[PDB]
Amino acid sequence: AKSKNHTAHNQTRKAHRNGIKKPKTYKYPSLKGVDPKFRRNHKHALHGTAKALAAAKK
Amino acid sequence: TFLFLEQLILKHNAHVDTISISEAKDGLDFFYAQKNHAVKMIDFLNAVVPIKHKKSEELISQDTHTGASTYKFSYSVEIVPICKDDLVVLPKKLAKSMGNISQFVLCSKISNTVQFMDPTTLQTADLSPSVYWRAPFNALADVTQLVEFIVLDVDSTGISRGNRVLADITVARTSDLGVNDQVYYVRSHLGGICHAGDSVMGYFIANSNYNSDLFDGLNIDYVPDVVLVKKL
Amino acid sequence: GKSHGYRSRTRYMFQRDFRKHGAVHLSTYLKVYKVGDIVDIKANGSIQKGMPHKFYQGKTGVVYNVTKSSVGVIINKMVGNRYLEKRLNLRVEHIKHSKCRQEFLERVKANAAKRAEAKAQGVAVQLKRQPAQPRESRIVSTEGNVPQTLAPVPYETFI
Amino acid sequence: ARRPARCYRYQKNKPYPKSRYNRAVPDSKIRIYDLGKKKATVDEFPLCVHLVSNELEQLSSEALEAARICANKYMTTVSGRDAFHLRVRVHPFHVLRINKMQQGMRGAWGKPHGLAARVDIGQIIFSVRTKDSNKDVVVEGLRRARYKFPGQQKIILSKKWGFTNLDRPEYLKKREAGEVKDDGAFVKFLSKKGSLENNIREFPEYFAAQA
Amino acid sequence: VNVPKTRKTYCKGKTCRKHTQHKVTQYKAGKASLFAQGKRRYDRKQSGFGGQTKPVFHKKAKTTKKVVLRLECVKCKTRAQLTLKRCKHFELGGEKKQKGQALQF
RNA sequence: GUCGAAUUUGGGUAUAGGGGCGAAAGACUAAUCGAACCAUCUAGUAGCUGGUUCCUGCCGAAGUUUCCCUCAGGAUAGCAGAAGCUCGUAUCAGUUUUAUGAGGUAAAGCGAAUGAUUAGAGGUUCCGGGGUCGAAAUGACCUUGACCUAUUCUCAAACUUUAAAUAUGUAAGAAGUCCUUGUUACUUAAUUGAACGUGGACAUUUGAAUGAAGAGCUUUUAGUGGGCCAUUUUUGGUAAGCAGAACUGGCGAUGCGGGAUGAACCGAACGUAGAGUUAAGGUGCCGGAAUACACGCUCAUCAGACACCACAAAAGGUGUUAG
RNA sequence: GUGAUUUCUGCCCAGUGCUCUGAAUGUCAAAGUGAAGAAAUUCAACCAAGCGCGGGUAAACGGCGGGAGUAACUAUGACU
RNA sequence: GAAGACAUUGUCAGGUGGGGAGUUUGGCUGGGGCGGCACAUCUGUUAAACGAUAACGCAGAUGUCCUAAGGGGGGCUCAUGGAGAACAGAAAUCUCCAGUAGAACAAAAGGGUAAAAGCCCCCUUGAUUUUGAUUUUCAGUGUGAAUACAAACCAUGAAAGUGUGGCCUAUCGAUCCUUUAGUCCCUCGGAAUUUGAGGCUAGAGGUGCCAGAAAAGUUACCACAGGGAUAACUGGCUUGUGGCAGUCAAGCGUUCAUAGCGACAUUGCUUUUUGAUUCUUCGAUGUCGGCUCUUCCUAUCAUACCGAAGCAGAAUUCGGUAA
RNA sequence: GGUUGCGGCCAUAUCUACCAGAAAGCACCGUUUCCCGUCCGAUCAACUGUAGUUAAGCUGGUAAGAGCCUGACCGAGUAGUGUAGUGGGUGACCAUACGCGAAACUCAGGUGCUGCAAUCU
Ligand SMILES: [Mg+2]
Ligand SMILES: [Mg+2]
Ligand SMILES: [Mg+2]
Ligand SMILES: [Mg+2]
Ligand SMILES: [Mg+2]
Ligand SMILES: [Mg+2]
Ligand SMILES: [Mg+2]
Ligand SMILES: [Mg+2]
Ligand SMILES: [Mg+2]
Ligand SMILES: [Mg+2]
Ligand SMILES: [Mg+2]
Ligand SMILES: [Mg+2]
Ligand SMILES: [Mg+2]
Ligand SMILES: [Mg+2]
Ligand SMILES: [Mg+2]
Ligand SMILES: [Mg+2]
Ligand SMILES: [Mg+2]
Ligand SMILES: [Mg+2]
Ligand SMILES: [Mg+2]
Ligand SMILES: [Mg+2]
Ligand SMILES: [Mg+2]
Ligand SMILES: [Mg+2]
Ligand SMILES: [Mg+2]
Ligand SMILES: [Mg+2]
Ligand SMILES: [Mg+2]
Ligand SMILES: [Mg+2]
Ligand SMILES: [Mg+2]
Ligand SMILES: [Mg+2]
Ligand SMILES: [Mg+2]
Ligand SMILES: [Mg+2]
Ligand SMILES: [Mg+2]
Ligand SMILES: [Mg+2]
Ligand SMILES: [Mg+2]
Ligand SMILES: [Mg+2]
Ligand SMILES: [Mg+2]
Ligand SMILES: [Mg+2]
Ligand SMILES: [Mg+2]
Ligand SMILES: [Mg+2]
Ligand SMILES: [Mg+2]
Ligand SMILES: [Mg+2]
Ligand SMILES: [Mg+2]
Ligand SMILES: [Mg+2]
Ligand SMILES: [Mg+2]
Ligand SMILES: [Mg+2]
Ligand SMILES: [Mg+2]
Ligand SMILES: [Mg+2]
Ligand SMILES: [Mg+2]
């Protein structure tokens, strides 16, 4: 006995029962994947402006 | 062996009764009106080449008035894959039985049955299809692995059972003759027809990485560096 | 059997246009991309390095990284009951700025000027775009323009 | 060899012409398409009559062959064999397939069978150009070509001149001046654009204003 | 394929850590050596009544091994491995391609 | 059939289950034999068949994805329920518009490249060959094809200069815009840039429409993994109530009115009653409702009578009716 | 194994078996022998039957074809 | 009397051993078998102009080849056509004009490329070291292949730069075991030293049924669980083929298309043929023919009445009503 | 406005054939000792602006040109196509209703635009 092999019937109906939702934008994305040479500097950059505001607000 | 078979079938001419011929990847199909026409062909094939075969059948009508159930028959023939001039490692038990021949051999004749020759110590041994198929193996290297050599001198030693055999052939590679200095010196069956300055073809075993387990069960030092298949 | 290679079905897609083969023009290389910019993807066929997969042909994302000869675009791709968030590393031939965002940016300067001028003028603004409203009345003159009477024509073959 | 023409009637499958993939196809039944007096000038045969199809159908290569013989055979005997020029417009390129044959459908793709046309509503099959007086022989000649085809087709008297893309009076407007010249079978007209040097080489009657 | 007997690549070895001359030959198996914990466990499991107590491989498919290269930096004698694609023939040293030679004999 | 012996037969005695016995049939071995009977291991195992016990309320599926000696089964995502938790006009939407991308199907084209293809006309021969005049000619006088010149007949799922419709990506602001001059081991010839900042300026016309029984998040678990039908596009096949795909709507899981009858057609989707109104379909009688009104056509010694649907063709006819 | 009487029982020992008052240095376990090492261990020589080699056997299992050429034509149950 | 340190007996070791025991003897599949591989992959097309998409659909390819056919730089222009040059002709070498690629780029097919990615030279090993992120196939797991960076060490080039194998899309493989390089670093647990063994990080030896069992037949003496998810017979859909009917009429029929024979085309009906399919039945619908016996169809062999004839008569042939 | 160096978009910039170029600049052009490359100082290398030219290159103009580029009550609201009906038709296919809308063909015009620096009767 042979089967029925493939279809996509009812697959688009199933999909919309629960939305098809977007993945939520965030203020501040991850620096995973970003140029290492740039990050290396940006770490040291904020340490300075925090210490500048810490010494300012003392 | 198929190109040989296609030539051999024409000489004696067993074909005529076929309706048509079609082809496929690794051979070709023959179609016959009557069942008894196709059996003569297989009996003819049994005569001239090593084979294995079997028949199965398909039913169609089953007429309730007798003398015509109407069956349709299919015979599946397999030629033995070791060709005429291949380089072969035999299995250990098989090699001990057939004359105590060495495991490292060339083929000889490829007739009704397959026959082997040992290029160094001239010797011969036969292998029938029934004995092949029960424990099947494959060739180490084919006709497409041959390499061109140039013969310089032949020193004969002695024996001649039927081919003026055991010639210590001094040879050098065609890619090496011009540039580089290197010489290979090897005993060979090609004694009667070998002359200095002749181009000869052969297997050059020194640079080939095989992957046969039979070959892996060998003596990485009793094995000959160079074997020459034929003149030209 | 089946065949699902990395560039299957791309006979006419990565093709090079008619009378526009050969070297890419220098203004392609002299354009400066920054983190945040919107860019459309369109794979040049001549440059084999840094190429996108056939899916991202015609998609438009945001930049997130910039490096020696490439940019990081970030696209949204849909799969099932969901969107995943996908990170590309394309060379700069296969990319160009979205002119829909550049249209927007210029309107922001227009609207800020309207509000700045409205305070100096004196109250009211109404700075939203209204869609095409239904059209008003008019008196179409017949002065040197009398109506031309027409009727349906009869069938003729001409073959 | 032949199946009934009712089987391969309607345009179902895609255009499947001869190429490097199909390769082997049988020879076309129809071979020569122009008949009558085909070394004739344009001024000789003004009155043009068509045979127009009124159905989206396939006409096989042997439906045209039997139709082309009977139209010619009647027109040759009655009006004489040099009183017309018959032209079969339709060329049969579409190859038909036949499943001539382990099991039935366990492996089933057909062999090539024969060539056929792909005719459309309002398409011209036969075109005949003739003298003014010799109409009734052409109308009755194409009547018997109609029985050899399936479907519905109709005969139409053309308003054009011969095989030209021009009406009865419009050709006579331009032929009186030096604006038309004979090509060989068909015809060439004057062009306002192009080089003025080789517009004077040919068309010697134009550029004069006299006769 | 064909390769040279020598290679000039990155040695790593405290005193090196730069590009240096490596000698090239070919990787050769190494013998099985009993007293290995596999062979001690196997010889116990076979001895007795019960027959063949392990799988025995027959259905082989491939025809060519991959080529591994022992590189020995001539300064520090620090060995380093390196692997190639599958191939039927393989040698090393000379036998170089010439300008444009036709077929002979 | 055989009926004086390789005869028939009582009692005693021997041979026991992978064993016996067998003038050989896999025959016989207590109605049991291609491995007897009895008890126990034993409630042996079964991806396979059959059954599975009270009422009501709310929600409500799947035959599809990947991997498996997988294809009458599982694991995995999916669809479903339940429990909630953080918040409370929320930001979103099987939709439109504005602005801006992507595509090579339909059509078109071939007097555009690629590949097929019917006709003549003008030329060109030191050059694929024949004839005519020849001692030969890189000669003429006739010719049939090759290519050349403008023409002409016809085409392409795996050709193409052009190129739709429908379907498809992104943007239309506070997580924003402008000024002010800080932070750095990154970047620049250059405190120039880059990325995130302090301080100040800009508010409910805060920057298209329409909508919003709230927006978001977590945990956990059932059934299912044989499908089938219909309009349009479609490949295999002569075709099929056939085999295989594409988008949508359905039956499966669904009664009610209509198609006499019917899984899928048309109408319409159901708590319990009264009154009104309609849908699809109808209004001679069966049968609830006009043997209504109006202009015409047709007479048949097989009339004709309502989609899906339960069939009819080429070809004819001084039948009759309009042109 | 064949299956009363009568008359016969053809050619074939390559293959598979069976067998041998035949060859001998090809293969080859465990014990023992030597060498190397601190020892556990490793490496060598030696080596039974069988295997392989050579004869016999078909009232053992079995098997008993083709192809060219022979001064027209003809090619034999001939000859090559 | 014989025989005698041989035999016999005991333990280990090699040979022989269907006499006996245990077990196995893929999957997809228009039934199953044979074949094929659609079983791991690649190009074009099927494929309906985003992406995804089936059939034992169509046209084909893979299990390799390369120290350059890799890296950088330099120097050039190809296929072909035309005009010229002793031997030299359609094909040898030299010179000129035209030449958007009609050439070439290891192999299938599709893209790509002109002071190049093609052809010829100079220099080389970036086909290297350390490990992370991303794309495709997807469960966003593995495998393979690729993208862009980083921290080192190099090649080339005057330099900008370029280079982490092969211009691009294919060219390959877990856990266990063995072994090689590295650390020459951990452990052998009463304490030590040297042999030996084990561990940590990175490769290799392989499973093509390619997410990876170690495997021959037979049953016509047969068994069990199921299957109408599936064959062998009636029925249904289909009608290619068979049978039967028109239409047009080639040739015939001494003159003469149509009294009558009647080819090929073109339009149908039949279910008395055979194919195609698998809807019903596998907890069973008795599977050939003959004998016997009723009834129905007409597509009428005879029997009744007619019309035509190339019907003198006789003897025929063709057609109508009629079962 | 013309030239030169470096360019942007890359035929309205090309191609075939003809015609004109004051200024300056480009160019062709002369030499072989040196660095350098050749079979060949032809190409590339250096030297001289010296001995000579607008004859070529280059720039602009001309052509009912070839091509290429923009339009048009040009073809055409056609071909094609989204949605609808117990619409027609034995079928093949065809009308109608809410919408979107081509290509060839035709005609008409056009034949480089511009950035930085330098330099010119
Ligand atoms: Mg299934
Ligand atoms: Mg499948
Ligand atoms: Mg690459
Ligand atoms: Mg033991
Ligand atoms: Mg009994
Ligand atoms: Mg139980
Ligand atoms: Mg509900
Ligand atoms: Mg498995
Ligand atoms: Mg079941
Ligand atoms: Mg396509
Ligand atoms: Mg088309
Ligand atoms: Mg197409
Ligand atoms: Mg499953
Ligand atoms: Mg089915
Ligand atoms: Mg169900
Ligand atoms: Mg319902
Ligand atoms: Mg009904
Ligand atoms: Mg409806
Ligand atoms: Mg009533
Ligand atoms: Mg016997
Ligand atoms: Mg007997
Ligand atoms: Mg024998
Ligand atoms: Mg024997
Ligand atoms: Mg013997
Ligand atoms: Mg013997
Ligand atoms: Mg045994
Ligand atoms: Mg045994
Ligand atoms: Mg057994
Ligand atoms: Mg199976
Ligand atoms: Mg099979
Ligand atoms: Mg697509
Ligand atoms: Mg290369
Ligand atoms: Mg201890
Ligand atoms: Mg491995
Ligand atoms: Mg392995
Ligand atoms: Mg068995
Ligand atoms: Mg049987
Ligand atoms: Mg029996
Ligand atoms: Mg029995
Ligand atoms: Mg069934
Ligand atoms: Mg029953
Ligand atoms: Mg019954
Ligand atoms: Mg009747
Ligand atoms: Mg000079
Ligand atoms: Mg110079
Ligand atoms: Mg001049
Ligand atoms: Mg022009």
Side-chain angles (χ1 to χ4, degrees), chain D residues 2-4 6 14 21 23 105-107 109 150:
Chain D
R2 285 278 289 111
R3 270 178 166 176
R6 66 103 102 76
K14 279 185 194 81
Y21 317 108
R23 299 196 204 79
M105 266 69 187
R106 175 136 35 117
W109 166 274

Side-chain angles (χ1 to χ4, degrees), chain C residues 136-147:
Chain C
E136 307 276 33
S137 82
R138 53 256 207 162
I139 298 158
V140 308
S141 182
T142 196
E143 192 166 32
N145 201 251
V146 183

Side-chain angles (χ1 to χ4, degrees), chain D residues 176-193:
Chain D
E176 285 170 24
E179 209 169 308
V180 187
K181 84 190 189 82
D182 294 18
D183 180 39
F186 194 51
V187 74
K188 286 181 169 170
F189 312 96
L190 186 76
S191 214
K192 290 279 180 294
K193 102 293 279 290

